Design a binder for this molecule. Sequence first.
Ligand SMILES: O=C(O)Cc1c[nH]c2ccccc12
Ligand SMILES: O=C(O)Cc1c[nH]c2ccccc12
Ligand SMILES: [Mg+2]
Ligand SMILES: [Mg+2]
Lengths: 204, 203
Amino acid sequence: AKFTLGCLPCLGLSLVPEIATDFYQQNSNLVMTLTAEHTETLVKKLDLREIDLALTMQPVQQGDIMATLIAEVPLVYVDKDYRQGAVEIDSIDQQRWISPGLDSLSTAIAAHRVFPATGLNVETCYMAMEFVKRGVGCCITDIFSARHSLTPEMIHQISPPMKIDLYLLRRADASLSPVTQKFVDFLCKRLRNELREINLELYP
Amino acid sequence: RAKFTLGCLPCLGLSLVPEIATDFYQQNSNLVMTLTAEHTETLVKKLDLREIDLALTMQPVQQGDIMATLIAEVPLVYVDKDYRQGAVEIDSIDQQRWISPGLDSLSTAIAAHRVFPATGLNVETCYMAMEFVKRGVGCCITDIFSARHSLTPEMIHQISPPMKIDLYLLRRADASLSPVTQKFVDFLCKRLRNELREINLEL
Ligand SMILES: O=C(O)Cc1c[nH]c2ccccc12
Ligand SMILES: O=C(O)Cc1c[nH]c2ccccc12
Ligand SMILES: [Mg+2]
Ligand SMILES: [Mg+2]
């Protein structure tokens, strides 16, 4: 059994290594490879057969890549500047906005508000969180990246609540092994379970 | 009216590049900064495609249209939850617990001293590997930046003989940087060098 999973950086910071660790400890006689890459690179690696599976927040219809919507992930407002509870997107100060590069994210936000161009554009979630921590500005990010890098006081639900879709991509012309099928099922169950606990913690 | 885009390796974006860019951004108004962290191959592709202006890597570029400024040498360290002591000889490392970092500049530096056989676990992003190490799953050799960022000092060990990898700032050979972007390059290179001079001392 041998498979390679690529994920977005927000998922590689902690959740995927936790899930992989639990599976790897329960199932030996396998070779697992893991990597974190932005979406465009994940799709390219699936098309070149450099990875078998990708976790993204955007569907694709390229080639024989099939994207399966597996969960909905909260989007949260993040800032060092104190906020009470939930944040309406129209209350955000566009002068402090850090524009996120994740197209899916920027596209989701843009459905609710078009932020003008700013002096700071950050395309990788954990680098944005560092700028938030140093007080340089504010952002909307996925909860996985916020939860990893920030204290709870810096994380705020949106009003109304905002989510982004989480997808599992694999090639359809390609065929999975049983162990890889078992891993995909385990991975999906643990991701859904984590989002359940996250919902509890986000409740204001 | 001044704009630049810098890509860096993940180990550098976890903390050091945001810190340095924060200091510059603030010293320079009327600036648009774009920052991204990507693996070496992607950085060089983006540089070639003109999607980024500058890339920080740990690998020079072969003959082509890329120029490469040698910033400093980066210590490599052994990381292990279970190892309690001091410097580790490469050949004393337990190959059954080895987490391979895939095929990258780091792996090439290790292979010049020891060729690890194939392992059950291959982890090609530094912070993901640090998570497996913190959970006790295996051991690795990594750059000092990713180690310091995710691990407690107890889990970080020097190698014997000491290993290093070179840090480069890459740019297109056929494109002239704007005056503010050159100023940022000088600032970045100096701060990175001095951060590593400080680290090399503490070791
Ligand atoms: O880097 C990623 O995982 C994509 C991404 C997720 N949240 C973000 C916030 C700001 C910029 C990029 C991202
Ligand atoms: O992911 C990166 O910055 C490259 C890299 C630096 N140290 C590492 C350890 C294990 C796997 C990859 C890396
Ligand atoms: Mg975390
Ligand atoms: Mg990354």
